[model samples]
Target: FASGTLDLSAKENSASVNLSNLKPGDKLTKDFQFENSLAIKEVLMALNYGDFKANGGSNTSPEDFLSQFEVTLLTVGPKNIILDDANLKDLYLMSAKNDAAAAEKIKKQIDPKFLNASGKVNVATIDGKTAPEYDGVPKTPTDFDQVQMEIQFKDDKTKDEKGLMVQNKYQGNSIKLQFSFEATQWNGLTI
Candidate 1:
């Protein structure tokens, strides 16, 4: 006869359902939809090795933070100058029409990033942490929070600037950029 006092208390907890559709750091380069101070959402990319660090689900990790990333050739000051819209159409057609000699001539002028790239529209979320808290909003906006951006045109617009303006009219730089991102196993944040 074994009579023992067993542990009688049981604990219960709950969590979000694990997604069968997505693994951690799964990249989803969907069309963005911001106007100014743009934002691209839930972009998916591969985890080359093990770069996705979920910040212990801190709700303040890279994945959860709506912070602006760097553009290699972007300048911060007043406005960006893009030439007339449809530059991709123009450039692609021109490149097709050009011979080797023309390519050599034009290639030097065109940036390699643009040349090799499939013409990805640029996007960035402003780091609102330093932003002055007005409008009853906090400094660092939470994930999915509505942040603001100011896309002002230069006083004297250039080809790039003018082009961007045209693109905005057409595709909208704010929301049209599809972010095809990648996250190393523990690099990106999580909510």
Candidate 2:
């Protein structure tokens, strides 16, 4: 067999999440399962956002809404990678940059060693040559990885005012956001 193929799939394909009527300090957790198929080498993951639409009496722009929300926790399998809370707006901006730039940004927010972990694929075993370590999803057909995201709406209260909330403009308003996931094949592979 001379032909080879690479495939990727998710347990919840094209699913939608609703975050309506959320209050300050409220958190939402979402879990995802991703898998790779036969003949695959490695898979790297990326996140992007799209299809933002305001609902109800929402006057907050998409950018503002995203900036106000924070991703408090992000984990790949059992490893909690996020070092500090990152706002959705910055994450979106990172997506617009190149992969290296995005990875650098993610490294700053996550554990620095996350992108160098192993066990996905050892190219040396397959091609009988030395290969660099990889940090990404496993290549086995039956192997799947879990990714968890914990998002929270900022609870900023005015210290001087004592009784005023900073997030009042978002009341009675909601926004629909589409979270996109991209998986790319292993870098520098020769077939």
Candidate 3:
């Protein structure tokens, strides 16, 4: 539903996330007090607030904040590899049982060394900058102050998955979301 160039040819557009704090494991773990369901129990990305979005615009150089944090969408077969999406439901990656059996089934249909799914991050931009600058260079004393980020998703459900006749929407159905992230403790990390 969202469309934008990933700017892959330039290093100034995107930055590698610092992830050294994460523990590498071959298996997904269920620790949210659920049964047979798996998810990431840690932060997916982290960066300094000043270096994240300064002056309400993206940074001017690669050394500054990023303007966009896009990610490649993960796919399997003819379907997406996302954990929860109606498109995934069409591929049976999730079910009403709220269990991992559907996911496991999809996993078997995918990779070998690891059952991994990938998708590009859909980061939002304000004013034209991804990593904006603060009012001043380097930033002021309050640059590192507490900040809150919000994410929203769109669901274009043309028709429910019932046997009844329904509109397929004027065009094909699509979903979109504004994804945001912030780590309360991470200052800098390396994967």
Candidate 4:
């Protein structure tokens, strides 16, 4: 599990993990959890296309290592910020042609409202009356949950490019996921 806390601030907060040493027919699963909950402004992710090349031009290919990836919530709080309803599928076929497609699918599942689009909600209004009001973020309890991360490698090995590239082109590539949330003392603690 990869976990950490980000302080609440006006600016954006981002964290990335380097997925490496993957073999054919392997699946790597990891977790990223926040220690506290802050009023989150938004969530965003990006994959920096990269590769590993040696002095002789032999390297690993991204297509041979990364086949599919998935992002899901292990524990979600609050109904408004929940993404479980989406039932998103795995971002698949990590080849030159399908990399963009996989990224696009992942992008579509993330709601911008939770990501910077909605802005901050410091004030909330009550609307039971004929008039209306706004609602503020819960100060005592954070409204977000830890996210589960999964990356899968292609099972096929024969399709790779020629030669045993000492270092595949995928070595330099990395994945970044950013979250903008409040960093306040949240509610209860769970195991």
Candidate 5:
């Protein structure tokens, strides 16, 4: 029998992370770990957003609210890697589209700094097939890899002639964030 197990710890399965009452310049950081019990070839990570709601007195669209924030992702085990360091809006734009063509259309509008050399955006790639030289989760069972993510609201200085900050509309609004991981078995292996 071929048996493989992958587990995520530290806030999995419908658990929530509170990010309420956030104002410009506020930041929050969370840490998590992944355990692999198989000789996985690689693990691909992705970020998803949902469950958007207005706390009260907030009419700001999810788009506008997300755009006002940024996300920074890092891997802290075996070796440190900066998986993603870009605006949350751009990252969502790159990953949320179900259509490839539509994603490319949106990709054109994204700042080039947020894109990899292959012109794609990703949260991170562990033992990446594209770059195997870099460190990744080993094939050993019970091995764990740790990750850290930081979310920050941009402290903007721009203001309208009335002196009202653009982010004011998002006051009391909130959104849910989720991360997904997919693992692949080593090539040329069969059950």
Candidate 6:
């Protein structure tokens, strides 16, 4: 699929995301939320969106990574994490169980322990920002909002036991339904 640097070092010429307003746990939780929200919900029209590697294989057709917001933060702090084509799957972190309602429910929660040393924040940036933004506590005001403020879930791994080591894909944290995209923007990937 990808044939370039595909690392954090490839900051130049590549897109980047900057999440804002996050603490230690907030950062972790938001990532989980984002991932869970992005995971495969149901098979969408891939002809114009992204490639799923036909059963999670490599050999991408080489299209530019498309993003939703160019650069954004949680609004509570100043931090960003870049998501590239390599980690695109990170967006698809959930299954096809109508996770929208569940994601929102979990996001509204605020861990009390985080209140003490919690003045701090967590930030994440996607090289190519896609998917949706935060929906709970700090409901983003606008798509151009500079920073993000809060997070509720950090779904590192589900009971399915899927992660870096589980290359089988079927043996790890995943679901049955797939997903699709509207594609308001396009960044054809280069080989």
Winner on TM-score between 1 and 6 is 6
Preferred candidate (lDDT higher): 5 or 6 = 5
| Model 1, span 1-191: residue lDDT tens | 22112111112111111112222232221122222111222211111111223333333233212111111122122322111122222232233443444334435444432231222212222332211222433444323222112212212222374464321221111111211331111122211
Better of 3 and 6 by lDDT: 3
Count backbone overlaps in model 5: 0
Q: In order, what lDDT does every prediction score?
A: 0.23, 0.48, 0.24, 0.35, 0.55, 0.22
Hey, what RMSD does candidate 2 come out at?
Answer: 8.7
Candidate topping TM-score: 5
| Cα TM-score of candidate 2 | 0.62
Against the hidden true structure, what lDDT does model 6 obtain?
Answer: 0.22
* Regions more than 4 Å wrong, model 1: 1-77, 82-88, 91-116, 123-191
lDDT of 4 at 128: 14
> Which of 2 and 6 is ahead in TM-score?
2
lDDT-wise, the better of 1 and 6 is 1
lDDT, candidate 6, 8-46, per-residue tens: 112122222232222112221121112112222111111
Residue-pair clash count for candidate 3: 26
Error of 6 at 57 (Å): 3.7
Worst 10 residues of 2 by lDDT: 118-127
- What is the TM-score of each predicted model, taking all chains together? 0.19, 0.62, 0.21, 0.43, 0.66, 0.20
Model 1 poorest 10 in a row by lDDT: 6-15
**Residue 131 lDDT in candidate 1:** 17
| Candidate 5: segments with Cα more than 4 A from true spot | 1-18, 56-58, 98-131, 134-144, 187-191
Task: Compare the candidates by lDDT and give the number of the best one.
Answer: 5
Which candidate do you rate higher for TM-score, 4 or 5?
A: 5
Candidate 3 CA-lDDT value? 0.24
